[PDB]
Design a protein around this ligand. Structure first.
Ligand SMILES: Nc1nc2c(ncn2[C@@H]2O[C@H](COP(=O)(O)OP(=O)(O)NP(=O)(O)O)[C@@H](O)[C@H]2O)c(=O)[nH]1
Ligand SMILES: [Ca+2]
Ligand SMILES: [Ca+2]
Ligand SMILES: [Mg+2]
Ligand SMILES: [Mg+2]
Length: 166
């Protein structure tokens, strides 16, 4: 049935894997193991539609990013993740978005901006700053915590809702 190909991108350590694993497997990964390229598939009902999520969890560490752009080519929508306690990861978002536009050869690609680790109080990216970035892109901004589950389903389901607008 309806399949949605989602790709999760962003700087090393922002919580791409923890977010995906919380969504799919319902637990929090406390440790840090850098990703090369992993995929997950699960059947879910989203707004009354039974569908299949195929999620590519990509490397954020440059050293482990070989051929990432090839893996990403098939993505239908992209979760652009930064951490709210990592200003550099937020600044990097523009470069991830440019890479997405390159691999899709389009300036109109479904995406959602995600500010993760919202359970932490060492915030250096304020909500309004991320809202403004997302506005400039024509996409939603959503905050998440892979640790508490806050916003996790919402982030991924919102991306499906963006793909459906394409
Ligand atoms: N407090 C808190 N810690 C988080 C959250 N998400 C991830 N972390 C922590 O941050 C570290 C990195 O998470 P991870 O998911 O591996 O990040 P990543 O973006 O997949 N890294 P990589 O690009 O190298 O694969 C882990 O120690 C993890 O527990 C969150 O929402 N809250
Ligand atoms: Ca755990
Ligand atoms: Ca291209
Ligand atoms: Mg990872
Ligand atoms: Mg500031």
């Amino acid at each position: 049935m309806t399949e949605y190909k989602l790709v999760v991108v962003g700087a090393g350590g922002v919580g791409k894997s923890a977010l995906t694993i919380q969504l799919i497997q319902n637990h929090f990964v406390d440790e840090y193991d850098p990703t090369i390229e992993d995929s997950y598939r699960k059947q879910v009902v989203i707004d009354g539609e039974t569908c299949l999520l195929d999620i590519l969890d990509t490397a954020g560490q440059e050293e482990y990013s070989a051929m990432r752009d090839q893996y990403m080519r098939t993505g239908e929508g992209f979760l652009c993740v930064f951490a709210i306690n990592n200003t550099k990861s937020f600044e990097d978002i523009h470069q991830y978005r440019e890479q997405i536009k390159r691999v899709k050869d389009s300036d109109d690609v479904p995406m959602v901006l995600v500010g993760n680790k919202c359970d932490l109080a060492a915030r250096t990216v304020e909500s309004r700053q991320a809202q403004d970035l997302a506005r400039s892109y024509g996409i939603p901004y959503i905050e998440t915590s892979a640790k508490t589950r806050q916003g996790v389903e919402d982030a991924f389901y919102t991306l499906v809702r963006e793909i459906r607008q394409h």
